[PDB]
């Protein structure tokens, strides 16, 4: 028993991290096969960031200007190209530690592990969710750009995120591995607003099921609700509307606990309306939304 | 900016995890050099666990009874010995992935990363603290025994914990890598009480400094206190008494923020006495104590 904000083991991703330097800017790159992927803003100076013309900036750069270092060994760059907001630096050596991998674009509300890196070196790993507003609440400092988000299914790493920037609000924005930003963000040092963030309702319910499985049951009540009644409450508390697709994904947890999804919705409704009254659920004094139903089943069943 | 419950990158530890089977029991082992370390209760049947005589049980076991598998390859056991609550299985092959390592006994209040494993395979990684009562609030299911806790300093892994059991209360107990239990626990399926747990005050203050660094400042007040006045409050709220050693360790964070430690203590005092009034600090509605002053500096400076 016990429930923790668990990240995937980061080993397969650590073996892919490299340092990329261009001019005076250093950030992280991801070395898979004979390609190094990194944020295209590696070619910018702090002055360029205010309004960069990436096409014009990249034209003043040659293969030899991109310094790629894997540990203490230098990689030879034989090609460079820009795909959306990422650069693909072709190198002459395939990464011997390349895991089985995929590039995936995750949906908002989905979770992933971030391997925070500096100078091509891993510093830490944590689990987070892609917010409904397509930002992530990460932990990133200067030099962390190019750090990636991922999920692991047995031996396959699905890379879903590459870190690019921190908004003036302190939340984080980045791209998929094809360089497409999640959300309306651009890689420019300009004021950019993330829209209203909402709570990922299906994840809160999944975590309530995890709480019941792990012994925390005080919040269970004698009430039930309907999807429409629940959604009136979800709207008022800036929670994502619950759909039958979400009820269906919660099926396994409903079956395991014997608590019908709409009954768990009524417990959630009462927690939203009355608060926690100074009590905790799984060591938290707020409703946690960064665990998907898949994460709850995985952690509660020991999937390796 | 941003502050997360970050674990160390687990790669160096993943390369050491093996599966150990004895009879019908399977758990995890740690393969370092030519030795595999695992909980000695791998030799028990569920019936033995109620009151095991490990010496007598181990005498009915030979080298060939310990099945050690690293991935899909079998290791040849050439020796076995019990050291406190761990078994050391000597194998004929040194682990080619053995990192630079140390075995350390951590102090209560210190933090470490746990690589949860099942059948010698890593499932997840999370950060936790050794509670003042020498338990950990982990996430462990059947087969997780032998999963280890560790810290990493550049290239050196300091192993500090090996998982052995879950108390009937749902908290976890284990040993250092010499097999010495943290706390009064024994490896027996009997009712065992963990003493009163207290909040790690120096860690809460460190996290309050992390909150100030990352923009969360609402809790700062116009008050100050003394170590004795603060400790009267700490005693009432089951917080560990603050010492000058703790004030000294908080020195760097006090210097970075310009907030004297006793002034941060007065903010903590007011938070203990008044609560949070429905507000949050670093995304938490409770006072977080599983970050040491070292963790705060490391995360806030990007140490890799
Ligand atoms: C180097 O400043 C530029 C800035 N970079 C970050 O926010 C990246 C990084 C971060 O997540 N936090 C943080 C804190 C301190 C830093 F020095 C750097 C960071 C940027 C702004 C707008 C668009 C783009 Br693309 C990049
Ligand atoms: C196999 O039960 C024995 C038990 N093992 C655990 O608690 C280990 C493990 C855990 O942390 N949770 C959990 C949940 C379900 C399990 F089946 C196993 C676990 C034990 C009790 C007393 C002393 C000793 Br040593 C070991």
Ligand 2 atom 19 nearest Cα: B142
The residue behind tokens 């999944």 is A206
Helix (H, G, I), strand (E, B) or coil at A149: strand
Helix (H, G, I), strand (E, B) or coil at A101: strand
Is B284's Cβ below 8 Å from some Cβ in A? yes
Residue (of A171, A235, A240) closest to A206 by Cα position: A240
State the distance from the centre of ligand 1 to the C-alpha of A117, rounded, in angstroms. 14
Q: Which chain B residue shows the shortest CA-CA distance from A214?
A: B170
Q: Is the CB of B147 under 6 A from ligand 2?
A: no
d(CA A54, CA B137): 48
Q: What is the assigned CATH class of domain B15-99?
A: mainly beta
Beta bridge partners of B86: B39, B83
| Residue A47 CA: distances (Å) to CA of A2, A22, A172, A192 | 49, 15, 21, 18
A201-213 helix and A293-301 helix, angle to the nearest 10 degrees: 20
Is A137's Cβ below 8 Å from some Cβ in B? yes
First-to-last alpha carbon distance for chain B, in angstroms, is 16
Q: Which two tokens stand for residue A219?
A: 């919040």
Q: Phi then psi for A50, rounded to 5 degrees? A: -65, -35
d(CA A42, CA A29): 10
d(CA B6, CA B23): 37
Range 2-21 of A in CB contact (< 8 A) with B: 2-12, 14-15
| Residue intervals in chain A for CATH 1.10.1840.10 | 198-301
Is A99's Cβ below 8 Å from some Cβ in B? no
Experimental method: X-ray
d(CA B85, CA B186): 9
Q: Are A113 and A161 in contact (CB under 8 A)?
A: no
d(CA B257, CA B271): 19
Ligand 2 atom 17 nearest Cα: B142
Give the mutation target among B136, B145, B186 for probing the ligand 2 site: most ligand atoms within 8 A of CB: B145
Residues of B in contact with A5 (CB under 8 A): 5, 126
Beta bridge partners of A20: A27, A68
Beta bridge partners of A82: A87
Q: Which two tokens stand for residue A126?
A: 């944590």
Residue (of B108, B117, B128) closest to B184 by Cα position: B108
**How many residues are given for chain B?**
304
| Residue intervals in chain B for CATH 2.40.10.10 | 1-14+100-197, 15-99
Residue (of A44, A43, A2, A35) closest to A16 by Cα position: A35
The answer to whether B118 contacts A304, with C-beta atoms less than 8 Å apart, is: yes
Q: Which residues contact B138 (CB under 8 A, 6 or more apart)?
A: A2, A4, B114, B116, B126, B128, B163, B172
Q: What is the assigned CATH class of domain A198-301?
A: mainly alpha
Q: What is the resolution of this structure in A?
A: 1.6
Helix (H, G, I), strand (E, B) or coil at A249: helix
Instruction: Choose the CATH number for B1-14+100-197 among 3.40.50.10330, 3.40.50.620, 2.40.10.10, 3.40.50.300.
Output: 2.40.10.10
Q: Which two tokens stand for residue A175?
A: 């791209």
Instruction: Region of A283 please: left (phi>0), alpha (psi -120 to 50) or beta.
Output: left
Which are the catalytic amino acids of A?
41, 145
Q: Which residues contact B241 (CB under 8 A, 6 or more apart)?
A: B201, B231, B234, B235
Q: Are A117 and A141 in contact (CB under 8 A)?
A: no
- HSE of A13 in the Cβ direction (CA atoms, 13 Å)? 34
Helix (H) or strand (E) holding A6: none
d(CA B263, CA A224): 48
Q: Which residues contact A69 (CB under 8 A, 6 or more apart)?
A: A18, A19, A21, A75, A120
Distance of CA B102 to the CA centre of its chain: 15
Residue (of A100, A273, A86, A287) closest to A200 by Cα position: A287
B293-301 helix and B201-213 helix, angle to the nearest 10 degrees: 20
Helix-then-strand count for chain A, H and E: 8, 13
Give the mutation target among A1, A215, A299, A302 for probing the ligand 2 site: most ligand atoms within 8 A of CB: A1
The answer to whether B9 contacts A4, with C-beta atoms less than 8 Å apart, is: no
d(CA B266, CA B232): 12
Q: Which chain A residue shows the shortest CA-CA distance from B120?
A: A304
Helix (H, G, I), strand (E, B) or coil at A121: strand
- The DSSP result for chain B, as a single string, is -----PBPP-HHHHTTEEEEEETTEEEEEEEETTEEEEEGGGG--TTGGGS--HHHHHHT--GGGEEEEETTEEEPEEEEEEETTEEEEEESS--TTPPEEEE--PPTT-EEEEEEEETTEEEEEEEEE--TTS-B-----TT-TT-EEEEEETTEEEEEEEEEEE-TTS-EEEE-TTSPBSSS--SSSS--------B-HHHHHHHHHHHHHTT--TT--S----HHHHHHHHHHTTBPPP-HHHHHHTHHHHHHHT--HHHHHHHHHHHHHH--TT--BTTBSS---S--HHHHHHHHHT--
The dihedral through the CA atoms of A297, A216, B292, B115 has a sign that is: negative
């Amino acid at each position: 028993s016990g429930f923790r904000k668990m990240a995937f083991p980061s080993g397969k991703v650590e073996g892919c991290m490299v340092q990329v330097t261009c001019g005076t800017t250093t950030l992280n790159g991801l070395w898979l096969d004979d390609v190094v992927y990194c944020p295209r803003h590696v070619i910018c100076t702090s002055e360029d960031m205010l309004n960069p013309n990436y096409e014009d900036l990249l034209i003043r750069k040659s293969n030899h200007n991109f310094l790629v270092q894997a540990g203490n060994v230098q990689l030879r760059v034989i090609g460079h190209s820009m795909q959306n907001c990422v650069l693909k630096l072709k190198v002459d050596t395939a990464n011997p530690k390349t895991p089985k991998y995929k590039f995936v674009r995750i949906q908002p509300g989905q979770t992933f592990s971030v391997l925070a890196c500096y100078n091509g070196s891993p510093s830490g790993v944590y689990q987070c969710a892609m917010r409904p507003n397509f930002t992530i609440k990460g932990s990133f400092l200067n030099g962390s750009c190019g750090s990636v988000g991922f999920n692991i299914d047995y031996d396959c790493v699905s890379f879903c995120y590459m870190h690019h920037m921190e908004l003036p609000t302190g939340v984080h924005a980045g791209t998929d591995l094809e360089g497409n930003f999640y959300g309306p963000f651009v890689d420019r040092q300009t004021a950019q607003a993330a829209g209203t963030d909402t709570t990922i309702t299906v994840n809160v319910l999944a975590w309530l099921y995890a709480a019941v499985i792990n012994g925390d049951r005080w919040f269970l009540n004698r009430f039930t609700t309907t999807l429409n009644d629940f959604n009136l409450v979800a709207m008022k508390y800036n929670y994502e509307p619950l759909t039958q697709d979400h009820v269906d994904i919660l099926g396994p947890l409903s079956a395991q606990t014997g608590i019908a999804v709409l009954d768990m919705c009524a417990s959630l409704k009462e927690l939203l309306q009355n608060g926690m009254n100074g009590r905790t659920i799984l060591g938290s004094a707020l409703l946690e939304d960064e665990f998907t139903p898949f994460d709850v089943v995985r952690q509660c069943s020991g999937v390796t």
